[PDB]
């Protein structure tokens, strides 16, 4: 209810459609010129952001202290505009929630919002071969083309949708300390 | 905001996924055993409703008094369950609204809600060759597979999404007197 209202404003102010050599993704700007994509978007030196060519200054594929994968790439973008700082909507640890909204913004899915219900800290997961941590889980007739989707509840940006098995979907938690 | 909350409850209680020989559609039950589909779904003596075979007793392709097309088929279904009566959420004439939500429920679009913004009484429209009346219009990066979608605002079921031109989308108004 209030979750949808938060989602729509957030997507309008901070999201974009991104095209890489590996597909089309929703991308969430976080602050300054830093954005986040699913790791498997494998952004190169340049991406297409909102049908518009944009240069990529830096790119960190995030991992935890064991080297385990977190399935997130942070990118610094060669653009003049700065993103509204949303680092205050990110938790410091994994957030479990009863009602969440998954928001998608690609050309295959232009401005769609999905009520996904219960979000649960799944923990570990083998994902496309790679073992992965800090996953959140929800019950989701998934499809491809939603990777990058932003998982939200009221006042909280919870994580980025990175995968699914046809029956459940998985978001990488978007944690505050990633963005110091 | 409240529009999303209304939409989600409505879809959960009264909508279904329908497959016909002509494609896959969202279908909205109205009361008793009467539902509505876009006309171009051309339902035959039997449809698949929620992956489940269902027999179709009667079917009216709606027209106005001049014979002009309204782009809606009403169907009576051979099932024991009755739909919750939502005829009170239907207006008696075309409703214009500032914020509407378009709700889709197919396998290509499982439980998606789209904020479509301004809904305007378009009036007449040539649609797939056919001249058509009582259309509502909103600005919509459309795609196919959303025909049947239910257009709503808070407390109001406005119409059924029947078409689009790539840039705008069009709903047939769902008017009370269709259901006497």
């Amino acid at each position: 209810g209030p979750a949808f209202e938060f989602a729509v404003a957030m997507m309008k102010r901070n999201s974009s459609t991104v095209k890489t050599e590996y597909g089309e993704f929703t991308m969430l700007g976080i602050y300054d010129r830093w954005a986040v994509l699913p790791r498997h978007a494998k952004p190169g030196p340049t991406i297409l952001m909102n049908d518009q060519e944009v240069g990529v200054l830096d790119a960190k594929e995030l991992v935890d202290k064991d080297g385990t994968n977190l399935e997130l790439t942070l990118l610094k973008l060669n653009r003049n505009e700065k993103f509204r700082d949303i680092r205050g909507f990110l938790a410091k640890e994994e957030v479990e929630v009863n009602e969440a909204v998954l928001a998608i913004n690609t050309s295959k899915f232009p401005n769609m919002y999905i009520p996904v219900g219960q979000v649960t800290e799944y923990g570990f997961l083998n994902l496309g071969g790679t073992p992965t941590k800090r996953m959140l889980m929800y019950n989701f007739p998934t499809r491809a083309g939603q990777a990058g989707g932003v998982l939200m509840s009221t006042g909280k940006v919870l994580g980025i949708h990175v995968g699914g098995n046809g029956h459940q979907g998985f978001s990488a938690a978007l944690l505050k300390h990633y963005f110091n």
Side-chain angles (χ1 to χ4, degrees), chain A residues 67-103:
Chain A
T68 322
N69 161 72
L70 294 173
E71 200 52 40
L72 299 163
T73 304
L74 315 185
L75 302 65
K76 191 184 214 295
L77 298 175
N78 204 24
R79 73 197 303 246
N80 176 93
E81 320 78 318
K82 315 184 65 192
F83 299 114
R84 173 187 66 138
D85 189 354
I86 57 169
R87 267 176 301 181
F89 300 105
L90 319 180
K92 277 155 74 284
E93 53 159 319
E94 293 95 310
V95 175
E96 285 179 345
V97 118
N98 264 357
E99 308 272 41
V101 176
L102 178 69

PDB file of all heavy atoms in Angstrom, chain A residues 67-103:
ATOM      1  N   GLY A  67      35.914 -14.041  -0.191  1.00  0.00           N
ATOM      2  CA  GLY A  67      35.864 -14.091  -1.638  1.00  0.00           C
ATOM      3  C   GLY A  67      34.573 -14.631  -2.219  1.00  0.00           C
ATOM      4  O   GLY A  67      34.427 -14.648  -3.449  1.00  0.00           O
ATOM      5  N   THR A  68      33.637 -15.079  -1.383  1.00  0.00           N
ATOM      6  CA  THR A  68      32.345 -15.518  -1.884  1.00  0.00           C
ATOM      7  C   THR A  68      31.634 -14.380  -2.602  1.00  0.00           C
ATOM      8  O   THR A  68      31.788 -13.197  -2.278  1.00  0.00           O
ATOM      9  CB  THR A  68      31.453 -16.015  -0.753  1.00  0.00           C
ATOM     10  OG1 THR A  68      32.241 -16.726   0.204  1.00  0.00           O
ATOM     11  CG2 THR A  68      30.371 -16.920  -1.296  1.00  0.00           C
ATOM     12  N   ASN A  69      30.828 -14.755  -3.577  1.00  0.00           N
ATOM     13  CA  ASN A  69      30.218 -13.784  -4.460  1.00  0.00           C
ATOM     14  C   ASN A  69      28.967 -13.202  -3.806  1.00  0.00           C
ATOM     15  O   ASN A  69      28.248 -13.888  -3.066  1.00  0.00           O
ATOM     16  CB  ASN A  69      29.917 -14.457  -5.795  1.00  0.00           C
ATOM     17  CG  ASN A  69      28.906 -13.729  -6.609  1.00  0.00           C
ATOM     18  OD1 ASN A  69      29.183 -12.659  -7.152  1.00  0.00           O
ATOM     19  ND2 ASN A  69      27.740 -14.355  -6.780  1.00  0.00           N
ATOM     20  N   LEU A  70      28.744 -11.905  -4.025  1.00  0.00           N
ATOM     21  CA  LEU A  70      27.512 -11.269  -3.566  1.00  0.00           C
ATOM     22  C   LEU A  70      26.567 -10.918  -4.704  1.00  0.00           C
ATOM     23  O   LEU A  70      25.439 -10.484  -4.431  1.00  0.00           O
ATOM     24  CB  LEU A  70      27.828 -10.008  -2.763  1.00  0.00           C
ATOM     25  CG  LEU A  70      28.554 -10.321  -1.462  1.00  0.00           C
ATOM     26  CD1 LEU A  70      28.966  -9.007  -0.828  1.00  0.00           C
ATOM     27  CD2 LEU A  70      27.638 -11.109  -0.536  1.00  0.00           C
ATOM     28  N   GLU A  71      27.016 -11.077  -5.957  1.00  0.00           N
ATOM     29  CA  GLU A  71      26.211 -10.949  -7.173  1.00  0.00           C
ATOM     30  C   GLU A  71      25.842  -9.501  -7.473  1.00  0.00           C
ATOM     31  O   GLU A  71      24.816  -9.229  -8.079  1.00  0.00           O
ATOM     32  CB  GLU A  71      24.956 -11.834  -7.121  1.00  0.00           C
ATOM     33  CG  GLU A  71      24.323 -12.137  -8.511  1.00  0.00           C
ATOM     34  CD  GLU A  71      25.303 -12.700  -9.543  1.00  0.00           C
ATOM     35  OE1 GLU A  71      26.165 -13.538  -9.183  1.00  0.00           O
ATOM     36  OE2 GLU A  71      25.214 -12.296 -10.723  1.00  0.00           O
ATOM     37  N   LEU A  72      26.696  -8.568  -7.109  1.00  0.00           N
ATOM     38  CA  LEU A  72      26.457  -7.162  -7.355  1.00  0.00           C
ATOM     39  C   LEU A  72      27.712  -6.514  -7.920  1.00  0.00           C
ATOM     40  O   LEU A  72      28.823  -6.763  -7.441  1.00  0.00           O
ATOM     41  CB  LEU A  72      26.055  -6.442  -6.087  1.00  0.00           C
ATOM     42  CG  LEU A  72      24.780  -6.882  -5.368  1.00  0.00           C
ATOM     43  CD1 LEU A  72      24.792  -6.334  -3.939  1.00  0.00           C
ATOM     44  CD2 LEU A  72      23.579  -6.356  -6.108  1.00  0.00           C
ATOM     45  N   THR A  73      27.524  -5.680  -8.936  1.00  0.00           N
ATOM     46  CA  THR A  73      28.568  -4.818  -9.462  1.00  0.00           C
ATOM     47  C   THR A  73      28.180  -3.379  -9.199  1.00  0.00           C
ATOM     48  O   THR A  73      27.065  -2.964  -9.526  1.00  0.00           O
ATOM     49  CB  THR A  73      28.764  -5.056 -10.959  1.00  0.00           C
ATOM     50  OG1 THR A  73      29.034  -6.445 -11.167  1.00  0.00           O
ATOM     51  CG2 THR A  73      29.936  -4.258 -11.489  1.00  0.00           C
ATOM     52  N   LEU A  74      29.075  -2.639  -8.567  1.00  0.00           N
ATOM     53  CA  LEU A  74      28.929  -1.200  -8.472  1.00  0.00           C
ATOM     54  C   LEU A  74      29.675  -0.528  -9.613  1.00  0.00           C
ATOM     55  O   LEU A  74      30.782  -0.930  -9.956  1.00  0.00           O
ATOM     56  CB  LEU A  74      29.463  -0.693  -7.137  1.00  0.00           C
ATOM     57  CG  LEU A  74      29.060  -1.476  -5.898  1.00  0.00           C
ATOM     58  CD1 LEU A  74      29.568  -0.758  -4.659  1.00  0.00           C
ATOM     59  CD2 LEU A  74      27.563  -1.635  -5.868  1.00  0.00           C
ATOM     60  N   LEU A  75      29.071   0.509 -10.183  1.00  0.00           N
ATOM     61  CA  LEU A  75      29.626   1.217 -11.325  1.00  0.00           C
ATOM     62  C   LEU A  75      29.646   2.701 -11.027  1.00  0.00           C
ATOM     63  O   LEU A  75      28.681   3.233 -10.470  1.00  0.00           O
ATOM     64  CB  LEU A  75      28.797   1.033 -12.594  1.00  0.00           C
ATOM     65  CG  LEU A  75      28.457  -0.272 -13.265  1.00  0.00           C
ATOM     66  CD1 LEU A  75      27.569  -1.121 -12.370  1.00  0.00           C
ATOM     67  CD2 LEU A  75      27.709   0.099 -14.526  1.00  0.00           C
ATOM     68  N   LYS A  76      30.724   3.371 -11.436  1.00  0.00           N
ATOM     69  CA  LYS A  76      30.808   4.825 -11.432  1.00  0.00           C
ATOM     70  C   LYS A  76      30.646   5.317 -12.865  1.00  0.00           C
ATOM     71  O   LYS A  76      31.327   4.826 -13.771  1.00  0.00           O
ATOM     72  CB  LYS A  76      32.137   5.304 -10.834  1.00  0.00           C
ATOM     73  CG  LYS A  76      32.205   6.812 -10.554  1.00  0.00           C
ATOM     74  CD  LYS A  76      33.591   7.224 -10.051  1.00  0.00           C
ATOM     75  CE  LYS A  76      33.522   8.359  -9.036  1.00  0.00           C
ATOM     76  NZ  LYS A  76      33.005   9.621  -9.635  1.00  0.00           N
ATOM     77  N   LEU A  77      29.748   6.276 -13.064  1.00  0.00           N
ATOM     78  CA  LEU A  77      29.281   6.662 -14.389  1.00  0.00           C
ATOM     79  C   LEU A  77      29.819   8.026 -14.797  1.00  0.00           C
ATOM     80  O   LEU A  77      29.898   8.945 -13.977  1.00  0.00           O
ATOM     81  CB  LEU A  77      27.753   6.696 -14.435  1.00  0.00           C
ATOM     82  CG  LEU A  77      27.021   5.381 -14.175  1.00  0.00           C
ATOM     83  CD1 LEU A  77      25.530   5.639 -14.150  1.00  0.00           C
ATOM     84  CD2 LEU A  77      27.387   4.349 -15.245  1.00  0.00           C
ATOM     85  N   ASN A  78      30.137   8.162 -16.085  1.00  0.00           N
ATOM     86  CA  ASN A  78      30.650   9.415 -16.640  1.00  0.00           C
ATOM     87  C   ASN A  78      29.487  10.303 -17.079  1.00  0.00           C
ATOM     88  O   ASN A  78      29.228  10.513 -18.265  1.00  0.00           O
ATOM     89  CB  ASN A  78      31.590   9.128 -17.802  1.00  0.00           C
ATOM     90  CG  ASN A  78      32.584  10.251 -18.043  1.00  0.00           C
ATOM     91  OD1 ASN A  78      32.898  11.022 -17.135  1.00  0.00           O
ATOM     92  ND2 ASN A  78      33.086  10.348 -19.271  1.00  0.00           N
ATOM     93  N   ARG A  79      28.774  10.831 -16.089  1.00  0.00           N
ATOM     94  CA  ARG A  79      27.682  11.753 -16.362  1.00  0.00           C
ATOM     95  C   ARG A  79      27.749  12.905 -15.366  1.00  0.00           C
ATOM     96  O   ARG A  79      28.338  12.788 -14.290  1.00  0.00           O
ATOM     97  CB  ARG A  79      26.308  11.047 -16.326  1.00  0.00           C
ATOM     98  CG  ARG A  79      25.801  10.654 -14.936  1.00  0.00           C
ATOM     99  CD  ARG A  79      24.677   9.606 -14.985  1.00  0.00           C
ATOM    100  NE  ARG A  79      23.531  10.031 -15.777  1.00  0.00           N
ATOM    101  CZ  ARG A  79      22.317  10.269 -15.285  1.00  0.00           C
ATOM    102  NH1 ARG A  79      22.070  10.123 -13.984  1.00  0.00           N
ATOM    103  NH2 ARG A  79      21.345  10.654 -16.104  1.00  0.00           N
ATOM    104  N   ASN A  80      27.151  14.036 -15.757  1.00  0.00           N
ATOM    105  CA  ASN A  80      27.192  15.268 -14.974  1.00  0.00           C
ATOM    106  C   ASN A  80      26.184  15.232 -13.830  1.00  0.00           C
ATOM    107  O   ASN A  80      26.485  15.655 -12.708  1.00  0.00           O
ATOM    108  CB  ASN A  80      26.928  16.460 -15.909  1.00  0.00           C
ATOM    109  CG  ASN A  80      26.843  17.804 -15.180  1.00  0.00           C
ATOM    110  OD1 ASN A  80      27.843  18.513 -15.046  1.00  0.00           O
ATOM    111  ND2 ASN A  80      25.639  18.174 -14.743  1.00  0.00           N
ATOM    112  N   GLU A  81      24.986  14.730 -14.100  1.00  0.00           N
ATOM    113  CA  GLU A  81      23.962  14.629 -13.074  1.00  0.00           C
ATOM    114  C   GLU A  81      24.411  13.667 -11.981  1.00  0.00           C
ATOM    115  O   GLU A  81      25.122  12.688 -12.235  1.00  0.00           O
ATOM    116  CB  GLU A  81      22.642  14.171 -13.704  1.00  0.00           C
ATOM    117  CG  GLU A  81      22.334  14.802 -15.089  1.00  0.00           C
ATOM    118  CD  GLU A  81      23.121  14.184 -16.279  1.00  0.00           C
ATOM    119  OE1 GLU A  81      24.342  13.918 -16.145  1.00  0.00           O
ATOM    120  OE2 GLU A  81      22.518  13.977 -17.360  1.00  0.00           O
ATOM    121  N   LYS A  82      24.037  13.981 -10.749  1.00  0.00           N
ATOM    122  CA  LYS A  82      24.302  13.114  -9.620  1.00  0.00           C
ATOM    123  C   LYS A  82      22.996  12.470  -9.194  1.00  0.00           C
ATOM    124  O   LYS A  82      21.919  13.050  -9.354  1.00  0.00           O
ATOM    125  CB  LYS A  82      24.918  13.884  -8.449  1.00  0.00           C
ATOM    126  CG  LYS A  82      26.029  14.837  -8.853  1.00  0.00           C
ATOM    127  CD  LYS A  82      26.673  15.492  -7.634  1.00  0.00           C
ATOM    128  CE  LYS A  82      27.387  14.461  -6.776  1.00  0.00           C
ATOM    129  NZ  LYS A  82      27.797  14.975  -5.431  1.00  0.00           N
ATOM    130  N   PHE A  83      23.095  11.258  -8.667  1.00  0.00           N
ATOM    131  CA  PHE A  83      21.916  10.594  -8.152  1.00  0.00           C
ATOM    132  C   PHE A  83      21.561  11.171  -6.793  1.00  0.00           C
ATOM    133  O   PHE A  83      22.438  11.483  -5.984  1.00  0.00           O
ATOM    134  CB  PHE A  83      22.146   9.089  -8.018  1.00  0.00           C
ATOM    135  CG  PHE A  83      22.462   8.382  -9.321  1.00  0.00           C
ATOM    136  CD1 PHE A  83      23.704   7.802  -9.515  1.00  0.00           C
ATOM    137  CD2 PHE A  83      21.504   8.263 -10.315  1.00  0.00           C
ATOM    138  CE1 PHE A  83      24.002   7.132 -10.683  1.00  0.00           C
ATOM    139  CE2 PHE A  83      21.793   7.591 -11.494  1.00  0.00           C
ATOM    140  CZ  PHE A  83      23.046   7.028 -11.676  1.00  0.00           C
ATOM    141  N   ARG A  84      20.269  11.297  -6.538  1.00  0.00           N
ATOM    142  CA  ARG A  84      19.825  11.556  -5.180  1.00  0.00           C
ATOM    143  C   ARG A  84      20.364  10.479  -4.249  1.00  0.00           C
ATOM    144  O   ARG A  84      20.318   9.292  -4.573  1.00  0.00           O
ATOM    145  CB  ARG A  84      18.308  11.583  -5.137  1.00  0.00           C
ATOM    146  CG  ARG A  84      17.775  11.688  -3.762  1.00  0.00           C
ATOM    147  CD  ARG A  84      16.318  11.549  -3.807  1.00  0.00           C
ATOM    148  NE  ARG A  84      15.947  10.215  -4.224  1.00  0.00           N
ATOM    149  CZ  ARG A  84      14.959   9.536  -3.653  1.00  0.00           C
ATOM    150  NH1 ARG A  84      14.276  10.087  -2.648  1.00  0.00           N
ATOM    151  NH2 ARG A  84      14.651   8.321  -4.080  1.00  0.00           N
ATOM    152  N   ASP A  85      20.898  10.888  -3.098  1.00  0.00           N
ATOM    153  CA  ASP A  85      21.549   9.943  -2.191  1.00  0.00           C
ATOM    154  C   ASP A  85      20.480   9.151  -1.456  1.00  0.00           C
ATOM    155  O   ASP A  85      19.712   9.717  -0.673  1.00  0.00           O
ATOM    156  CB  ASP A  85      22.461  10.667  -1.203  1.00  0.00           C
ATOM    157  CG  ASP A  85      23.318   9.703  -0.380  1.00  0.00           C
ATOM    158  OD1 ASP A  85      23.129   8.467  -0.496  1.00  0.00           O
ATOM    159  OD2 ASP A  85      24.200  10.177   0.372  1.00  0.00           O
ATOM    160  N   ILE A  86      20.430   7.841  -1.688  1.00  0.00           N
ATOM    161  CA  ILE A  86      19.448   6.992  -1.028  1.00  0.00           C
ATOM    162  C   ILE A  86      20.100   6.044  -0.037  1.00  0.00           C
ATOM    163  O   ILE A  86      19.442   5.122   0.461  1.00  0.00           O
ATOM    164  CB  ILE A  86      18.581   6.223  -2.040  1.00  0.00           C
ATOM    165  CG1 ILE A  86      19.424   5.361  -2.983  1.00  0.00           C
ATOM    166  CG2 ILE A  86      17.713   7.186  -2.826  1.00  0.00           C
ATOM    167  CD1 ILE A  86      18.573   4.389  -3.818  1.00  0.00           C
ATOM    168  N   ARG A  87      21.377   6.263   0.281  1.00  0.00           N
ATOM    169  CA  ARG A  87      22.083   5.393   1.213  1.00  0.00           C
ATOM    170  C   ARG A  87      21.401   5.276   2.567  1.00  0.00           C
ATOM    171  O   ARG A  87      21.714   4.346   3.317  1.00  0.00           O
ATOM    172  CB  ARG A  87      23.507   5.896   1.422  1.00  0.00           C
ATOM    173  CG  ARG A  87      24.529   5.277   0.511  1.00  0.00           C
ATOM    174  CD  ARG A  87      25.849   5.933   0.753  1.00  0.00           C
ATOM    175  NE  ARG A  87      25.733   7.356   0.493  1.00  0.00           N
ATOM    176  CZ  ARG A  87      26.738   8.208   0.600  1.00  0.00           C
ATOM    177  NH1 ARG A  87      27.935   7.776   0.974  1.00  0.00           N
ATOM    178  NH2 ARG A  87      26.540   9.487   0.331  1.00  0.00           N
ATOM    179  N   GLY A  88      20.499   6.199   2.912  1.00  0.00           N
ATOM    180  CA  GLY A  88      19.783   6.092   4.163  1.00  0.00           C
ATOM    181  C   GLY A  88      18.630   5.122   4.141  1.00  0.00           C
ATOM    182  O   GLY A  88      18.109   4.753   5.200  1.00  0.00           O
ATOM    183  N   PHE A  89      18.201   4.710   2.958  1.00  0.00           N
ATOM    184  CA  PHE A  89      17.179   3.683   2.846  1.00  0.00           C
ATOM    185  C   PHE A  89      17.764   2.278   2.847  1.00  0.00           C
ATOM    186  O   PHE A  89      17.008   1.306   2.847  1.00  0.00           O
ATOM    187  CB  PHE A  89      16.358   3.906   1.577  1.00  0.00           C
ATOM    188  CG  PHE A  89      15.650   5.226   1.532  1.00  0.00           C
ATOM    189  CD1 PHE A  89      16.110   6.250   0.726  1.00  0.00           C
ATOM    190  CD2 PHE A  89      14.484   5.430   2.261  1.00  0.00           C
ATOM    191  CE1 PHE A  89      15.440   7.476   0.671  1.00  0.00           C
ATOM    192  CE2 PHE A  89      13.813   6.646   2.217  1.00  0.00           C
ATOM    193  CZ  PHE A  89      14.289   7.671   1.423  1.00  0.00           C
ATOM    194  N   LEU A  90      19.084   2.147   2.856  1.00  0.00           N
ATOM    195  CA  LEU A  90      19.738   0.852   2.881  1.00  0.00           C
ATOM    196  C   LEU A  90      20.014   0.461   4.319  1.00  0.00           C
ATOM    197  O   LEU A  90      20.480   1.279   5.114  1.00  0.00           O
ATOM    198  CB  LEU A  90      21.057   0.873   2.098  1.00  0.00           C
ATOM    199  CG  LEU A  90      21.168   1.619   0.769  1.00  0.00           C
ATOM    200  CD1 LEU A  90      22.573   1.452   0.250  1.00  0.00           C
ATOM    201  CD2 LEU A  90      20.190   1.097  -0.262  1.00  0.00           C
ATOM    202  N   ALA A  91      19.726  -0.791   4.646  1.00  0.00           N
ATOM    203  CA  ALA A  91      19.994  -1.309   5.966  1.00  0.00           C
ATOM    204  C   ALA A  91      21.472  -1.619   6.135  1.00  0.00           C
ATOM    205  O   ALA A  91      22.252  -1.628   5.178  1.00  0.00           O
ATOM    206  CB  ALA A  91      19.187  -2.566   6.219  1.00  0.00           C
ATOM    207  N   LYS A  92      21.852  -1.895   7.381  1.00  0.00           N
ATOM    208  CA  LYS A  92      23.211  -2.314   7.688  1.00  0.00           C
ATOM    209  C   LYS A  92      23.355  -3.832   7.717  1.00  0.00           C
ATOM    210  O   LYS A  92      24.482  -4.351   7.671  1.00  0.00           O
ATOM    211  CB  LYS A  92      23.654  -1.694   9.017  1.00  0.00           C
ATOM    212  CG  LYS A  92      24.167  -0.262   8.850  1.00  0.00           C
ATOM    213  CD  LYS A  92      24.062   0.590  10.098  1.00  0.00           C
ATOM    214  CE  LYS A  92      25.114   0.216  11.128  1.00  0.00           C
ATOM    215  NZ  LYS A  92      24.788  -1.059  11.866  1.00  0.00           N
ATOM    216  N   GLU A  93      22.242  -4.552   7.750  1.00  0.00           N
ATOM    217  CA  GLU A  93      22.242  -5.997   7.642  1.00  0.00           C
ATOM    218  C   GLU A  93      20.948  -6.401   6.948  1.00  0.00           C
ATOM    219  O   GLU A  93      20.098  -5.559   6.645  1.00  0.00           O
ATOM    220  CB  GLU A  93      22.404  -6.642   9.017  1.00  0.00           C
ATOM    221  CG  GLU A  93      21.410  -6.147  10.041  1.00  0.00           C
ATOM    222  CD  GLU A  93      21.243  -7.117  11.205  1.00  0.00           C
ATOM    223  OE1 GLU A  93      21.198  -8.346  10.953  1.00  0.00           O
ATOM    224  OE2 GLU A  93      21.156  -6.652  12.366  1.00  0.00           O
ATOM    225  N   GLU A  94      20.800  -7.700   6.701  1.00  0.00           N
ATOM    226  CA  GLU A  94      19.700  -8.182   5.874  1.00  0.00           C
ATOM    227  C   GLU A  94      18.348  -7.917   6.538  1.00  0.00           C
ATOM    228  O   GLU A  94      18.157  -8.207   7.723  1.00  0.00           O
ATOM    229  CB  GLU A  94      19.885  -9.674   5.603  1.00  0.00           C
ATOM    230  CG  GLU A  94      21.089 -10.014   4.720  1.00  0.00           C
ATOM    231  CD  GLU A  94      22.340 -10.384   5.523  1.00  0.00           C
ATOM    232  OE1 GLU A  94      22.719  -9.626   6.450  1.00  0.00           O
ATOM    233  OE2 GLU A  94      22.948 -11.440   5.220  1.00  0.00           O
ATOM    234  N   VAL A  95      17.405  -7.373   5.758  1.00  0.00           N
ATOM    235  CA  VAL A  95      16.080  -7.003   6.242  1.00  0.00           C
ATOM    236  C   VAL A  95      15.083  -8.062   5.816  1.00  0.00           C
ATOM    237  O   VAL A  95      14.947  -8.346   4.621  1.00  0.00           O
ATOM    238  CB  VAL A  95      15.648  -5.635   5.694  1.00  0.00           C
ATOM    239  CG1 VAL A  95      14.209  -5.323   6.112  1.00  0.00           C
ATOM    240  CG2 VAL A  95      16.562  -4.579   6.186  1.00  0.00           C
ATOM    241  N   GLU A  96      14.361  -8.623   6.773  1.00  0.00           N
ATOM    242  CA  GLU A  96      13.249  -9.504   6.459  1.00  0.00           C
ATOM    243  C   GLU A  96      11.949  -8.732   6.622  1.00  0.00           C
ATOM    244  O   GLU A  96      11.823  -7.894   7.515  1.00  0.00           O
ATOM    245  CB  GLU A  96      13.264 -10.743   7.344  1.00  0.00           C
ATOM    246  CG  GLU A  96      14.336 -11.725   6.945  1.00  0.00           C
ATOM    247  CD  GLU A  96      14.356 -12.925   7.845  1.00  0.00           C
ATOM    248  OE1 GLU A  96      13.740 -12.856   8.934  1.00  0.00           O
ATOM    249  OE2 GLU A  96      14.983 -13.938   7.470  1.00  0.00           O
ATOM    250  N   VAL A  97      10.987  -8.996   5.745  1.00  0.00           N
ATOM    251  CA  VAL A  97       9.807  -8.149   5.682  1.00  0.00           C
ATOM    252  C   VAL A  97       8.641  -9.005   5.223  1.00  0.00           C
ATOM    253  O   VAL A  97       8.828 -10.050   4.594  1.00  0.00           O
ATOM    254  CB  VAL A  97      10.096  -6.924   4.773  1.00  0.00           C
ATOM    255  CG1 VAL A  97       9.199  -6.881   3.551  1.00  0.00           C
ATOM    256  CG2 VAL A  97      10.059  -5.611   5.582  1.00  0.00           C
ATOM    257  N   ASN A  98       7.432  -8.591   5.601  1.00  0.00           N
ATOM    258  CA  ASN A  98       6.244  -9.390   5.319  1.00  0.00           C
ATOM    259  C   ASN A  98       5.613  -9.057   3.979  1.00  0.00           C
ATOM    260  O   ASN A  98       5.077  -9.951   3.314  1.00  0.00           O
ATOM    261  CB  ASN A  98       5.204  -9.207   6.420  1.00  0.00           C
ATOM    262  CG  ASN A  98       5.276 -10.301   7.453  1.00  0.00           C
ATOM    263  OD1 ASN A  98       6.065 -11.242   7.320  1.00  0.00           O
ATOM    264  ND2 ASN A  98       4.454 -10.195   8.489  1.00  0.00           N
ATOM    265  N   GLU A  99       5.653  -7.785   3.585  1.00  0.00           N
ATOM    266  CA  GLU A  99       5.144  -7.329   2.296  1.00  0.00           C
ATOM    267  C   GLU A  99       6.227  -6.504   1.618  1.00  0.00           C
ATOM    268  O   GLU A  99       6.636  -5.463   2.143  1.00  0.00           O
ATOM    269  CB  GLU A  99       3.871  -6.496   2.469  1.00  0.00           C
ATOM    270  CG  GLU A  99       2.810  -7.170   3.308  1.00  0.00           C
ATOM    271  CD  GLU A  99       1.893  -8.065   2.489  1.00  0.00           C
ATOM    272  OE1 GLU A  99       2.389  -8.779   1.588  1.00  0.00           O
ATOM    273  OE2 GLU A  99       0.669  -8.058   2.751  1.00  0.00           O
ATOM    274  N   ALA A 100       6.696  -6.972   0.470  1.00  0.00           N
ATOM    275  CA  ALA A 100       7.665  -6.236  -0.321  1.00  0.00           C
ATOM    276  C   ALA A 100       7.123  -6.042  -1.725  1.00  0.00           C
ATOM    277  O   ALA A 100       6.249  -6.787  -2.176  1.00  0.00           O
ATOM    278  CB  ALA A 100       9.002  -6.965  -0.389  1.00  0.00           C
ATOM    279  N   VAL A 101       7.662  -5.034  -2.412  1.00  0.00           N
ATOM    280  CA  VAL A 101       7.335  -4.740  -3.804  1.00  0.00           C
ATOM    281  C   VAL A 101       8.610  -4.848  -4.631  1.00  0.00           C
ATOM    282  O   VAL A 101       9.638  -4.268  -4.267  1.00  0.00           O
ATOM    283  CB  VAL A 101       6.708  -3.344  -3.954  1.00  0.00           C
ATOM    284  CG1 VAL A 101       6.464  -3.037  -5.395  1.00  0.00           C
ATOM    285  CG2 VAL A 101       5.396  -3.250  -3.176  1.00  0.00           C
ATOM    286  N   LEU A 102       8.547  -5.598  -5.732  1.00  0.00           N
ATOM    287  CA  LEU A 102       9.646  -5.691  -6.690  1.00  0.00           C
ATOM    288  C   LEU A 102       9.318  -4.814  -7.892  1.00  0.00           C
ATOM    289  O   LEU A 102       8.257  -4.965  -8.501  1.00  0.00           O
ATOM    290  CB  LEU A 102       9.868  -7.138  -7.116  1.00  0.00           C
ATOM    291  CG  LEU A 102      10.969  -7.308  -8.161  1.00  0.00           C
ATOM    292  CD1 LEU A 102      12.324  -6.998  -7.510  1.00  0.00           C
ATOM    293  CD2 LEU A 102      10.940  -8.692  -8.714  1.00  0.00           C
ATOM    294  N   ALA A 103      10.202  -3.877  -8.205  1.00  0.00           N
ATOM    295  CA  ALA A 103       9.960  -2.873  -9.231  1.00  0.00           C
ATOM    296  C   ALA A 103      10.928  -3.082 -10.371  1.00  0.00           C
ATOM    297  O   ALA A 103      12.136  -3.158 -10.144  1.00  0.00           O
ATOM    298  CB  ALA A 103      10.132  -1.461  -8.684  1.00  0.00           C
TER     299      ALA A 103
END
